[PDB]
Amino acid sequence: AIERLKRYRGLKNLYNCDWQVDEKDPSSPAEWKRLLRIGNYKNTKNRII
RNA sequence: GCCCGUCGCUAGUACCGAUUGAAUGGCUUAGUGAGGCCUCAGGAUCUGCUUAGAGAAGGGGGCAACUCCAUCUCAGAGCGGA
16 A cells, blocks of 8 residues: 555645646656647637637 | 726727728819710712603605604703602
8 A cells, every 4th residue: 555655645625725737756757848838728729820 | 085906918899090002972173075866067879750862673654765753771961859
């Protein structure tokens, strides 16, 4: 139970918790850093047309 | 009073008009003005009835050419009509 439960957090509510997108994790892909971080969809969708 | 009121950004929402580039419509200025009508001329062209000249077929008479009129083609003088 120790080795399988290291990447977990002990929050209490799904709507009253906080998370980060840039957390360090071995389960995270190495190419996640090589991914585009697009801000807003509809603005660049209108821009690209 | 008073609260959600400044700052720059993400898109949207109404604007003005100092703006040009066209086009539409109505008043107005000046000039041009098609087409038909009526009217003044014009006369490509055609054509009817009189009267001149040249040719034929017919009959009557000098009986020998020649003469009288009868029926047609071309060219003139006309009056004309469209």
